[PDB]
Amino acid sequence: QQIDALRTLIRLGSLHTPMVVRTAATLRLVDHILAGARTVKALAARTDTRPEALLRLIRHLVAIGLLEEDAPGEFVPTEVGELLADDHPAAQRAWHDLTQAVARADISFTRLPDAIRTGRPTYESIYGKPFYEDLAGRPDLRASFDSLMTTAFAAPAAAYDWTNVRHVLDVGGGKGGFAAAIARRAPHVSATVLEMAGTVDTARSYLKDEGLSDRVDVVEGDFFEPLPRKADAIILSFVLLNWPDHDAVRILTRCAEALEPGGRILIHERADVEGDGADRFFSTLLDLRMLVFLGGALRTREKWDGLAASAGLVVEEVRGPLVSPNVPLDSCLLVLAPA
Amino acid sequence: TVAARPQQIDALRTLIRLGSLHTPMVVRTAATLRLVDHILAGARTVKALAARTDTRPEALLRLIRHLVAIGLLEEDAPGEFVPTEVGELLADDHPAAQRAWHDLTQAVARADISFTRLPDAIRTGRPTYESIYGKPFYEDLAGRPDLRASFDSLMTTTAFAAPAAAYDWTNVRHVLDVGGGKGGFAAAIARRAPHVSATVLEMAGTVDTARSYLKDEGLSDRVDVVEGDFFEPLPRKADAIILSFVLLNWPDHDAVRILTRCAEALEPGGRILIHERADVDRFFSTLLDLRMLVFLGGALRTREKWDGLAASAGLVVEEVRLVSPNVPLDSCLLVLAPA
Ligand SMILES: CC[C@@]1(O)C[C@H](O)c2c(cc3c(c2O)C(=O)c2c(O)cccc2C3=O)[C@H]1C(=O)OC
Ligand SMILES: CC[C@@]1(O)C[C@H](O)c2c(cc3c(c2O)C(=O)c2c(O)cccc2C3=O)[C@H]1C(=O)OC
Ligand SMILES: Nc1ncnc2c1ncn2[C@@H]1O[C@H](CSCC[C@H](N)C(=O)O)[C@@H](O)[C@H]1O
Ligand SMILES: Nc1ncnc2c1ncn2[C@@H]1O[C@H](CSCC[C@H](N)C(=O)O)[C@@H](O)[C@H]1O
């Protein structure tokens, strides 16, 4: 009765289990196993690890249900464990790779009390630069982050009607997947992706390869500055949660000043609601991630109305639960009009 | 179109739970802020909680949301949070001391940061603690008396009566508890066999806490305490020399160094008693074993590994007695004799 509470709490507060997974991801272990390395001796060679040490790590991967000893000395991935394959469409190996952007950013959680004391992010205290200024100097991290955010925008593009939309402006649109999804849904629409340096190059590649350059262009810029052009739909897809309140209102005010008459601003975000249930585990992961990464947050409908009002907008409507293929969390789309 | 397959989303939701860094650090933050003690002391609103914890209220409520989601807190009344049964273990007076084991300002939860560089320990085989805090574990503690004290308190959580009944002290006159901590093992023995005297061999600072604890137990007359280094010649000889949760702190060559010192300190017909978990719930065995890796380059050891280590120091494993208290992990007692 009390040992179960004791076993639960130790298990909840255990730091070695998440880091065992992340180490297994960074080492590309499941890939090497599926590539024919069953033993510790071969796996340790492929992963350039000490065999004694690798086995102790494997012992825990077996214990938490990711690896299984099928035949003596041979380890294979379980059903959950196969999701650590590098070509799995959930991209969970890349999400737990300590060399890529997100899992490297998750070290900010080691200083959570600081962020709770101040409400301000800890990523800078660990890595010396705020997140996006750090990506701007680390082309490997900029590259790996941009590919993670693309893990296809089909549901959010169907939740809007484009018939009288002429141009679309995807502010912070990453690689262009949302803009490309729109262009595939409405052949008359042209779009522009306003993105950061480095990201603009891979946004132009993806749109070229989609065959859509003749319709979706890319502008490198800053969305706290005057936006490059006016549009009938200004898209904010997973941007505003990166930002404290005054910075989100800044972005919105810039998006409002670029709205054509009858235009709209589209916030495509997870907005936490009170009665999620078992869905709160992943809402709180994102929200806390936004705190320690950047000082941003997930917002409720009440908060958006205040943000929109501060930016001279108003929340017309929210389109219901939007389901994406390989996420644990549905998102939604808020339609904003001039106040 | 988008296709949401539950069995995939369940395994995906499972893996994210396993690799998530925020759940353990949320717990660790709750323990360091002493959140459960404050709620018990009459702070129920997040306002009073933030005032007692000196945190930003909006940031504290976002931490509580995950605490509620992982089942350590529940919302009795709106804005009113209380510790669940599992969460009650975070109370500082609880006998499992779980809040202190998760206190980021105390020794163990602080040392757990070594896990953030686990791939380094798996690639190279020895600890990462020094690369984070500037010194190997016990040298760090010698310069931080708060951590020295904090660690010593933690290790005291029976009071060693369980493995004390496992040895027959009839023909033991004096006992040397090498690295004996506060003296609980010495005291547990002394309280069980009134003829045996004892000498505890410990480090600076720990000698004071051991000395004072052995006086408040009515035992200064019987158990002596000597400050020393067990890599050096032991201060005197004994009929039983205890190594209780010492050798797992050390790689193979340092362990045979300690064992040699004990064999050289043996009275004729004397024995060396190793008190540890002999590697064979695997979840909690792996925590200690991997902790000993990233903390100190140590490890749990199977019996066959003990035979080699014993031989290298001129010892032989005489018998292995499986103790079974009520903690997650059961300890064993290896008896070692000269060859
Ligand atoms: C919340 C669950 C979710 O599935 C929802 C959504 O897919 C999402 C996630 C993660 C992130 C971002 C997302 O939008 C994101 O924008 C972001 C960012 O801008 C800057 C740094 C990290 C992140 C980041 O880690 C997913 C997740 O697995 O963990 C939080
Ligand atoms: C097997 C694990 C166990 O559950 C049971 C066991 O009592 C034990 C634990 C923890 C520690 C030590 C233990 O012996 C221990 O000796 C030690 C040490 O010598 C030096 C530094 C840290 C530690 C340390 O953190 C418990 C635990 O909570 O997980 C490891
Ligand atoms: N100051 C700034 N100006 C322009 N873009 C910025 C910016 N600060 C952050 N960003 C961009 O905002 C994006 C947030 S991630 C959003 C990606 C994409 N819109 C999607 O829905 O998947 C990042 O790609 C980052 O490059
Ligand atoms: N070089 C050294 N000489 C003497 N003691 C040492 C030492 N290096 C580490 N130690 C001690 O080894 C102990 C390991 S923790 C074990 C404590 C006690 N035997 C128990 O069972 O609870 C620590 O108290 C630490 O102070």
Residue numbers in the entry:
A (entry chain A): 12 to 162, 167 to 354
B (entry chain B): 6 to 162, 166 to 288, 294 to 334, 337 to 354
Task: Give me lines lifted from the publication on this model.
Tailoring steps catalyzed by SAM methyltransferase-like proteins have yielded particular insight into evolution of anthracyclines and generation of structural diversity. DnrK is a canonical S-adenosyl-L-methionine (SAM)-dependent methyltransferase that catalyzes 4-O-methylation in daunorubicin biosynthesis. Recent studies have uncovered that DnrK is bifunctional and catalyzes additional 10-decarboxylation as a moonlighting activity. Here we have taken advantage of the natural diversity of anthracycline methyltransferases and employed extensive chimeragenesis to probe factors that govern catalysis and substrate recognition.
Both DnrK RTTD and DnrK RTTR became exceptional generalist enzymes, with the ability to use any of the substrates to catalyze reactions, yielding all potential products albeit at different yields. The presence of R1 from RdmB in both chimeras shifted the reactivity from 4-O-methylation towards 10-hydroxylation, with less than 15% of the native DnrK activity measured, compared to almost 60% 10-hydroxylation conversion. Structures of DnrK RTTD and DnrK RTTR in complex with 1 revealed the molecular basis for the expanded substrate specificity. Regions R2 and R3 are observed in a closer interaction with each other when compared with all structures in complex with 2, closing the active site to stabilize the smaller aglycone substrate. The α11 helix hosting R3 is extended by a single turn, which positions the helix in the space vacated by the absent carbohydrate unit. This structural change allows stabilization of the substrate via hydrogen bonding interactions between R163 and the 6-hydroxyl group of 1. As an example, DnrK RTTD and RTTR differ only in one amino acid, K190 and N190, respectively, that is located in R4. The same inter-region interaction (3.5 Å) may be observed in DnrK RTTD in complex with 1, but the hydrogen bond is not present in DnrK RTTR in complex with 1 due to the shorter side chain of N190 (5.6 Å).
